Design a binder for this molecule. Structure first.
Ligand SMILES: Cc1cc(-c2nc3ccccc3n2CC2CCOCC2)cn(C)c1=O
Length: 127
């Protein structure tokens, strides 16, 4: 039932970087995905309590949402783009794992992933 602590968005020990690839992930990719009509269910951690999904965090052991990714990019938490791209891929994969094919949330995830792949193909080379 109980919601776990959200994923870490702050860690003063962890060394941080501002790269053009990370600037692109915030300014181009996240901005595009966040404003999409199907973004809202992905903008915050799954609230298992509110949704009465006591199973959710029994099945999903690496939760991720765009709220966390947004916080991680705004607060320069990442070392490289691969870390941030992994977070997006975890958010999509968690959706496909927990939910059934054809479910509304999976159709929303599929739309968002398509856009995400488009923008990631155009990832700038490291400056
Ligand atoms: C299982 C699940 C639920 C939601 C979710 N978050 C909601 C917030 C408020 C209200 C409903 C919420 N849901 C359920 C879906 C919302 C969109 O339509 C399908 C149900 C999001 N994701 C990524 C999931 O994997």
């Amino acid at each position: 039932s109980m919601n776990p602590p959200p994923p870490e968005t702050s860690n003063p020990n962890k060394p941080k970087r501002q790269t053009n690839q990370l600037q692109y992930l915030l300014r181009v990719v996240l901005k595009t995905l966040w404003k999409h009509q199907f973004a809202w269910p992905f903008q915050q951690p799954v609230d298992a309590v509110k949704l009465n999904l006591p199973d959710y965090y029994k099945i999903i052991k690496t939760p991720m949402d765009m709220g966390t990714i947004k916080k991680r990019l705004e607060n320069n938490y990442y070392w490289n783009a691969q870390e941030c791209i992994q977070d997006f891929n975890t958010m999509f994969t968690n959706c496909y794992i927990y939910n059934k094919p054809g479910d509304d949330i999976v159709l929303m995830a599929e739309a968002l992933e398509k856009l995400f792949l488009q923008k990631i193909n155009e990832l700038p080379t490291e400056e």
